[PDB]
């Protein structure tokens, strides 16, 4: 690949998979779009 690619936003140690509706932040997995919301006040509905 080109190497076109964006990190995750939370941990950024691999690529993203997702990004919050919210918080924006493109996440490489549930596990770090979970991660946010237990300390940023997140649930991910968009207008939560
Ligand atoms: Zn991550
Ligand atoms: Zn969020």
């Given at each position: 690949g080109p190497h076109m690619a964006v990190l995750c936003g939370?941990?950024?140690?691999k690529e993203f998979k997702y990004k919050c509706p919210r918080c924006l932040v493109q996440t490489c997995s549930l596990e770090c779009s979970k991660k946010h919301k237990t300390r940023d006040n997140c649930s991910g509905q968009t207008h939560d």
């Open positions: 939370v941990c950024g140690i």
